[PDB]
Write a protein that binds this ligand. Structure first.
Ligand SMILES: Cc1ccc(CCCO)c(NCc2ccc3nc(NCCCN4CCOCC4)n(Cc4nc(C)ccc4O)c3c2)c1
Lengths: 426, 426, 426
């Protein structure tokens, strides 16, 4: 299942055996709520009724403007996360366009409405207060329960300038969301995947407050499309590889900057430089293509042979040999340099390995924690097999007198080109 | 209204036609809540009463210490976001200083109190529980409704170490906030602007828990002053401009780093390097001067002539010709390089343009989405006119043999100085 | 108590007199909730009962997977913030392991349970709904109050993919938390420190939803261990030090990059490059060692003598002489360059100092605000003594013709090595 290799030569590690679920597109749905325009038992409902009016009044000043959004991570492009959503929203403001929906959801709560600009959208009426108020109201406990949802949606939108994420159970109750997934124009694989991970789907969704007109409240829910499912993913962990000379400051370092999540995708490889745009559930990785780069499948060759002629593996250089650790999926990389105390420990047994200077690695099998300096790291105790791939630390292949000691957006070939240049001049 | 130019020569775009609203100062207000010190129907109120006591008790251990706060974005200074607020808070701890406020808000809920260090502050009593408990309490539903606000403010402060933002309707109800804006010593223009955008104002405000002494709870609300309104703003979007040679890795790139929000301000131009410190509502940009740089109005000359002699336009260089896109206000910039598939599409019609290698641009007029590699971007469908300004890609003016391929905090003149130096040596 | 020195020579300032509280380890505790498996007065409880069932049902699809987590800040390592917690969680899934806890908390609510892998954990039953429902239920107001907590924990976990922080009073009520701290295997110093700062402890804790099996709900609370208390801490503030020549762009700059929080720790000094991983309460600094570097105590020598031979003080260079300010603990650093207007002001008196070009500093004593360009900074009005340490701005010691104008990850010796190299070639 989940496995991991460590490369002693490049001070990196790859965790493989993951299955993609990349948000690729968006599905927009219009959620609605129909509204009403209007002793001791009475006075308490008069208070609960003004709560209603206040919520509505508050939702109205909220919509005096169209809703807002305006290592190698810096290489990414720039999106408009909710452009699709808002695009749908601006259409609901058109006259009659509201009345089509008010009409469509008359005998049912869940209908598909074709809109005037050709977007076919799944509409949903999740709360009919008009029906409740105009009849049942025109018991103090009954009303408070029905009204409470309305007020809470109002709180979320008011403190979020009218765009919320993750999408809450107020915006879309669990049962409403699951059923919304079912009636959705997608595959049986997406339907199951989404349904088995509704808490994730929520995190990847947007609730955009839209309009209050003609006794109707509308807000667009922006839901993820996972066009890429069950393709291989692997996570690349890198740590700094430095020399270990005695005199501190005479050392040269080197770090692979191409770390992140990597997934096979449509011939190429989707690269996620910020591995917090990805959420791992067991062996499934949920990613967002908005936060990715599209690289050749040859990018994977840097792992095994960082000197390969097919892809120019990206690194960075420095003379800053500080100690740290990276806690991988199935173990720990340790960069021990200078006078730092770095160890690995078991729970009850205590210290079971003292790391020598340079980049080393230990697997979580038998290890519970890792210490580098004053920093205690707990390792992930997830089940899986590690493979330590012994090799000569490539930092040893460079002569320190002609080693460029402050490159960030660099690569193996760019370093050799700067060495070849400085070598010539000598 | 909103318009946009694309510069084919510098691979950038400027969206103009926006109106400033920059937070420049802060207004502090002291919000108060007066407190009380003390079968089946009874037992439920005994539970609701201990909820009260627990909230108070919790608010008390919370205040055993003074409240806490201690591309070109890295160039910004560093503020103390709530220094003004806390400055006011430390004054309320002085003896008698509480009793002045308890006194002032005796016959009214909204009074201005001059404090001992010369700060004149608008005080506000938004909930008189003392009055309710000592009289009405010393019905089970009535008490729960009145008490509930107190508990919720207590939740917000307890999970936020006593400083909340955005400011909630619990901290300051909509009606309380609007009326607080009205009695505020500001212009008619600020009052209207603030009131039309209370959800934004909330996002730009702070609620700082302050003190519980002498039957009084106090917390300072820190509200934005918009000293700059209705001055021109424009947003600069940049993308990487690379050469497009066949052999991958023989290409040189170049990106304008001076991207962000730009606003006219008091002779100079306020620059916002992190365009997420700015919130756009329709055509109004709300910004924070805390997150800005003060640049000459001559900074705008980089757009039209990046080679102008009046301002040294800031760029960065690399050899990393990866493909991406930037979704502008009224369109999309596309940096297509190497073997990447980049297209633009309409909704129902499909693909309507295939981008060739190099930096190009397309407007949202007729386009719904843009694709660069495995990444689908939706364009903003906001209404407005785009202008494509044809020009020769300046990256072509540089000889690759003497082009500095890893500059970040650089400029046009710094690159020429490094070229002039390396040229001489040859 | 709290004091501060400014170094005119290096354009930096150090605020000293703080007391450490560094999270070093984690304490895991298993919180439980025991569950039940099953006219006008009746119908409302039938609604409150399905709320129960819905919450439970929702908590169940939430746990179809193991919970998720997968200037000089870039030098830090990488942790697995909740690895310890999840490590404990995966154990509760083992058969019988639940039934041990269900058993242990039969006659009490707070017991220590040894688990099958040798971890001794403090278990806690904070809500016995099984007892309430199977007896009292098998009044409409009573049930709603008891049930409400359950629903709210369910909301927190559902919108957070099952991992929450800060830990709320729903997850662990104030009284439950304090008492959990008391029965904890730690010192009298940690117990008092933790208890006096429960709002902070909450911010530094994790609530990880774990399991629903055998009428039991379990979630692990991950609580901080403060192994380092009451050791000296100091905060280093740096600002750019540039020359002040007339012709703009002929100036060279220099900034100390080693800014952050610094604390004495076990022979070495814990360095916190991102001073927002640290929370200051009065004179106590709460830090996380996960976000730190372990440096020699000789790092403090850069303050007084940045040219000292014991530690290679870290700086960065540029030619970007933009004006800004840094608001220190007891004052303000001002970097005024070019045509910028920089001043310092009192509240009622107005402007009391106009800053000349170059890096200067003013103390909060008598000053309320500082202005640099269009940016108004309020200074922290915290009480304490400042010391201005006059010295020659070291940027004057460098010849601009051979000054490396774009170094980031550099140091005093690396700059001299690049100068010595370029000097030789001339
Ligand atoms: C210059 C500068 C200013 C601010 C930041 C971010 C501040 C952290 O919050 C950074 N990034 C962190 C960071 C950490 C180590 C870095 N090392 C470098 N290389 C120095 C560039 C100069 N080159 C050319 C001249 O001769 C010396 C080497 N850069 C510059 C650099 N940086 C990026 C992201 C892309 C391309 C690039 O050449 C670094 C940036 C860099």
């Amino acid at each position: 299942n989940i496995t991991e290799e460590f490369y002693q030569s490049t001070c990196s590690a790859v965790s493989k055996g993951y299955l993609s679920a990349l948000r690729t597109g968006w599905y927009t749905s219009v959620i609605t709520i129909e509204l009403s325009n209007i002793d001791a038992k009475v006075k308490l409902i008069k208070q609960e009724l003004d709560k209603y009016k206040n919520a509505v009044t508050e939702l109205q000043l909220l919509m005096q403007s169209t809703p807002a959004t305006n290592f190698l991570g810096f290489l990414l492009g720039v999106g408009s996360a909710i452009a699709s959503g808002v695009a749908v929203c601006k259409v609901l403001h058109l006259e009659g366009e509201v009345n089509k929906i008010k009409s469509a959801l008359l005998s049912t709560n869940k209908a598909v409405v074709s809109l005037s600009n050709g977007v076919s959208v799944l509409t949903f009426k999740v709360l009919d207060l008009k029906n409740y108020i105009d009849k049942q109201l025109l018991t103090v406990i009954e009303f408070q329960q029905k009204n409470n949802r309305l007020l809470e949606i109002t709180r979320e939108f008011s403190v979020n300038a009218g765009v919320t994420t993750p999408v809450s159970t107020y915006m879309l109750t669990n049962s409403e969301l699951l059923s919304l997934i079912n009636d959705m124009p997608i595959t049986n694989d997406q339907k199951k995947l989404m349904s088995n991970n509704v808490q994730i789907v929520r995190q990847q969704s947007y609730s955009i407050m839209c309009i209050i007109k003609e006794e109707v409240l509308a807000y667009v829910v922006q839901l993820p499309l996972y066009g890429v499912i069950d393709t291989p993913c692997w996570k690349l962990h890198t740590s700094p590889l430095c020399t270990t000379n005695t005199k501190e400051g005479s050392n040269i370092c080197l770090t692979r900057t191409d770390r992140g999540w990597y997934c096979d995708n449509a011939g190429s490889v989707s690269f996620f430089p910020q591995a917090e745009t990805c959420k791992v559930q067991s062996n499934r990785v949920f990613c967002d293509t908005m936060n990715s780069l599209t690289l050749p499948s040859e990018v994977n060759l840097c792992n095994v042979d960082i000197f390969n002629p097919k892809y120019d593996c990206k690194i960075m250089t420095s003379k800053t040999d500080v100690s740290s650790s990276v806690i991988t999926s199935l173990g720990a990389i340790v960069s021990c340099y200078g006078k730092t105390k770095c160890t690995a420990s078991n729970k009850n047994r205590g210290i079971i390995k003292t790391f020598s200077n340079g980049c080393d690695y230990v697997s979580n099998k038998g290890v519970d924690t890792v210490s580098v300096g004053n920093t205690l790291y707990y390792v992930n105790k997830q089940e899986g097999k590690s493979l330590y791939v012994k090799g000569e630390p490539i930092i040893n292949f460079y002569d320190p007198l002609v080693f460029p000691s402050d490159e960030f957006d660099a690569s193996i070939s760019q370093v050799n080109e700067k060495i070849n240049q400085s070598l010539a001049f000598i």
